[PDB]
Every structure is written in structure tokens, then in C-alpha cells.
Design an enzyme around this catalytic site. Structure first.
Site, PDB file in Angstrom:
ATOM      1  CG  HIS A   1       5.588 -34.079   1.002  1.00 18.10           C
ATOM      2  ND1 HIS A   1       5.468 -35.366   1.519  1.00 18.10           N
ATOM      3  CD2 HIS A   1       4.974 -33.253   1.886  1.00 18.10           C
ATOM      4  CE1 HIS A   1       4.870 -35.287   2.705  1.00 18.10           C
ATOM      5  NE2 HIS A   1       4.570 -34.040   2.951  1.00 18.10           N
TER       6      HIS A   1
ATOM      7  CD  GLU B   1       3.747 -29.902  -0.553  1.00 23.43           C
ATOM      8  OE1 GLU B   1       4.061 -28.999  -1.385  1.00 23.43           O
ATOM      9  OE2 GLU B   1       4.351 -30.982  -0.489  1.00 23.43           O
TER      10      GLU B   1
ATOM     11  N   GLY C   1       7.749 -38.009  10.896  1.00 21.74           N
ATOM     12  CA  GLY C   1       7.952 -38.450   9.522  1.00 21.74           C
ATOM     13  C   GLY C   1       6.942 -37.842   8.536  1.00 21.74           C
TER      14      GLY C   1
ATOM     15  CB  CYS D   1       2.992 -41.203   7.367  1.00 27.10           C
ATOM     16  SG  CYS D   1       2.841 -40.929   9.151  1.00 27.10           S
TER      17      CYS D   1
END
Lengths: 182, 180
Positions: B40, B71, B145, B147
Site C-alpha cells: 500500500h 501485501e 496510521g 507507517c
């Protein structure tokens, strides 16, 4: 990782020291001037180590409520050559429950440690190591030895210090603004 | 435990700050100039590594032999420094774990260590509408988030954080066979 951790980090980076007593190393939150807090079971005496520097204790007061029940908070004034950033405006005025808190620890054993503990309940009474204690906050995280004194925050609020656990749950003593009127 | 030593040792030598078009991500370097990052992150032709503009020579969005997303994106970087080889700390197989640490490293969150505890082999997850395999799961009762960060146990580098649902956090498994 997110805005909760951001606020926790900002507190850790400026308002904590490593305190050593004969009973171990603790995370210690500085609140204003030369005034800090630590769990009462740390057994602060006349001399304490602050970041490995021998420091005289000018005053220490184990807090109890007006029913004369243990609160498990000791307020220490250190003979230190530097003041803490004043964070009293981040302390809650009243007893409360909270969402989405972080427990943050900084010791030799556990440097730069941050734990998302989730929802915090106003638990109230706890028999803490055999001692009736009031104003306890509870979170459903398996906290462990080394975390006592760790700071519990939400975004914008410093709400407690970690004082114990039972293996499944962790427990913190409330910090209230009224403890630190000068 | 020695879990915290291990997490710090991996962070110190093998973790860098990667910046794509989407912002900053904790990046794990594995060996040579090969590193991993969540898919992502949308890795392009150019990436920043510790604030240095760096050509990406190759990027592979990993999928398994069922043709399902994992992923993880493997990247080969045009830079002189070589990563300390840590392929021997990667698990051979899918597994559950205890007493894991998630280690975050960005400009905003430098050197941050998050004990997450028990990690389950969760398996299948619909992640952002994409069917995904080989997901590890831990309690994570916050909305984080993008990160991410590196997940370790004592002696093993087991995964990289790729998402969460506000209660649980999810990591993509790292396996030894991805880098043979």
C-alpha cells in the site's frame, strides 16, 4: 504510529526521568518545577538516583484520600538543577473513564516502550498487594514487572501512573490537577 | 526479556525511513540492497531512504502460488550501503508466536517499541477490499496510521505491519523462501 502515540512521545521526551530507589528502577513523571511523581511502593527515601545521578529529596508525600485510604501516588520534590516543563494543564480535574489510552515506559530494561492499552475504566477500589487503594484506573492489558511508574495518556491528557496488575489487567493511580496546586 | 534487545538490534542496523508519494513508512532491509515495505506504500521509480533520493531498480508486489496478494513489496535499491544479512532470522513456515514487539521508525516516531504480546496465524483477510493471505494478528486497540513497523520475537523477524481495524492489528508474514 498515530496521534495518541504522538502525545505520549511528547510527554516522554521532556517530562520523564529514570528514578532508582532500593526497590528498583521506575519511570518517573515530572509535572512542574522540580516536582515529580512515582508509585508509593517505590519507597522513596532521603536520596534517590535520577538518570544515574545522586539526588537529594527535598520533600516526599505519600498521598491518601480524605477517608485515609492509600492512593499509591508519592509526590517528590527533587534537589535538581533544572525544572520540568509545566504539564499541569494536561491533568484531568475529575475522576473519569477514558477511551484509547497509551501506557509509556522508559527504563534501562524497557527503553522507548509504548503500549496501546485501549479503554480505561474508573475501577475505583482495588486491594493492591494487600493494601486497600482508591481512585484506580483499569485497562485490559497483561502488564508486567518493569512497567510501574509508566505514564498513562490520551490525546491531550495525562491521566495516571501504572501501579500494578493481575496478569490479565493493568492498574493505574489517577492523576488529578488538584494534587499539584502550589 | 531479550526480546527488547533483539528488537533494538534489528532496528539499529536493519531499519530505515522510506518515503513514497504516500508519505513515510518503516522499511526493513533484509540483505544486500533488498528491502521490504507494505504494498500500500505505492512504491514508484524513485524513493527517499533516510531523506536521500534513491532509484528503485526493481519492485515486486508479492503474491503466493494461489495468485493471492501477500501485501509485501520487495524492492532492490540503487545505493552503496549494504544491509546486514538477517535472512537467518526469518521463519521457514507459518506459525503463532508469544511476546512479540512492533518497532516503528519514522521522522515523527523515531526509535519507538510497541510490545503487542500474543501473535496469531490469522490467515485470510479482506484488506481494503483485496483478499490477502498469511496475515498475523495481535491486539491493537487504537486506530494507527499507515507507517507500519517491524514485528520481532526473541530470535526471529516474523512480519511487517500492514493494517488494522481499531481493535486488532495485522502484519504480513516474512518467510525465508521469499528471499532465496
Amino acid at each position: 504510529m498515530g496521534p495518541g502515540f504522538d502525545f505520549a512521545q511528547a510527554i516522554m521526551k521532556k517530562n520523564t526521568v529514570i528514578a532508582r530507589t532500593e526497590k528498583g528502577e521506575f519511570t518517573m513523571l515530572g509535572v512542574y518545577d522540580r516536582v515529580a511523581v512515582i508509585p508509593t511502593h517505590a519507597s522513596v527515601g532521603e536520596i534517590i538516583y535520577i538518570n544515574d545521578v545522586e539526588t537529594r529529596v527535598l520533600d516526599a508525600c505519600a498521598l491518601r484520600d480524605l477517608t485515609d485510604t492509600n492512593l499509591e501516588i508519592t509526590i517528590v520534590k527533587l534537589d535538581r538543577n533544572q525544572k520540568f516543563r509545566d504539564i499541569r494543564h494536561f491533568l484531568p480535574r475529575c475522576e473519569d473513564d477514558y477511551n484509547d489510552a497509551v501506557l509509556s515506559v522508559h527504563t534501562s530494561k524497557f527503553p522507548n516502550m509504548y503500549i496501546p492499552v485501549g479503554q480505561v475504566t474508573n475501577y475505583g477500589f482495588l486491594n493492591l498487594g494487600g493494601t486497600p487503594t482508591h481512585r484506580i484506573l483499569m485497562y485490559n492489558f497483561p502488564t508486567r514487572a518493569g512497567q510501574c511508574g509508566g505514564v498513562v495518556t490520551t490525546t491531550g491528557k495525562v491521566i495516571g501512573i501504572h501501579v500494578g496488575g493481575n496478569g490479565a489487567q493493568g492498574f493505574a493511580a489517577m492523576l488529578l490537577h488538584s494534587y499539584f496546586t502550589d
